[PDB]
Amino acid sequence: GKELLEAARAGQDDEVAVLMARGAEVNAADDVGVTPLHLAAQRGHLAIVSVLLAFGASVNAADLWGQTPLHLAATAGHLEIVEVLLRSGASVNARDNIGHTPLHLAAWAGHLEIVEVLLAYGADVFAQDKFGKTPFDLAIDNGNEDIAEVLQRLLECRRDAEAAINYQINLELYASYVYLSMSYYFDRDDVALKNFAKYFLHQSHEEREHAEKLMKLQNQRGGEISLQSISSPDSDDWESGLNAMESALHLEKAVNASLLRLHKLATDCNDPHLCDFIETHYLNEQVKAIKELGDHVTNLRKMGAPESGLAEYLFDKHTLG
Template identity: 50%
Template sequence: MHNSKARQNFMKECEDAINQQINIELQAAYDYMAFFTYFDRDDVSFPKAAEFFRKASHEEREHAEKLAKYQNKRGGRVCYDDIKCPKKTEFNGLEDAMETALSMEKTVNQSLLNLYKIAEQNNDPALCDFIQNEYLHEQEDAIKQFADYVTQTIRVGNGLGEYLFDKMTLN
């Protein structure tokens, strides 16, 4: 065990849950890199989608860093797990990618809700506040955005519709 001078009212269960969330965010960042590199390929060539997913990867990595800084602030220790190879590195168009991303964001959101519940059960209002203000609202926005994109990519279809979606919607 460690002897942090900053640790106060910070239970091991909360520390472990934060570590789990850090690793989930890093996995999402890695997965979004696969989206980026797929859409950046010359035989796929959706440049706005590539940039959109590159930014999504960067954002997930920032989420992990913010959680790691919070863990240190509270006197916890960051523990990293192995990051697995992305489950999908090829997509059947933008609709498939948006559906996959929507599912990922829902998984991340559920994990954050579980973290919030653990914080509540351990009487940690500071952690509850941090998760709610820094993550939950943003996750709701991301889920809505990807749900909209799924609907829109279905509506426009493949071919020219995807091209126009990439060119005019993703920025």
């Protein structure tokens, strides 16, 4: 009923064994709320926590102070207990009264391997306590040096991915604006080409769908969209249909280069979902766009444009309409 806890505290693995074989209280709440699992985690005793878990102990046991065996085990420094608790269902994001999470304590105490296993199981790096500190702060105010480095790397990966997605949103909005300009150039009455105009209006709308997809993505990730100013296109007079097609080709190539840079960034920081998203929705459309626009340019050049009217007229009639 109560005589098991002192044997757990003294490390009497055989005594708690023989006394738990006989019907005994496994989920004992004590004079301050310390279950035998808590005391078996404070001291480093793997056999006791194993034979206690097998007999039906609770890994999440709300101590009178707000602690859990994972808290005390991460604070102590015993890695095997941390592993066997994480595999049994311990919650990596449980709070104290101060608000500390097991990673706060892992960073304060200075346990690198425990920090790694806690980061693998879903502990978040920018979580705060009541007083406003993140594990990186408890790491830098205590001289624990490498905890700080491996947490700074993750903070920086998240910040840089957020920034690159914002820049891609701005780049697609700019491309949409450039295509709108191109389209209303071919609508003048000294440039009377209607299917060039329809072509570039269609591209203008597709490029806005592209940017809204990235906005939705960044809201799904929990990041912050920060919209910016959209530059005006470099020209108002796109001299001909050939020159406009070549400018669209260079623009599509620049967009594709930015996508490749963002993909390499998401690969460095171990982000499978971002890489899958980029290559599923964005890398096969750019290849097809570049192929098609290069086809248009060689067709127009062979037919004899720009020095030939009746080349752009018949291209506009037969290929674009």
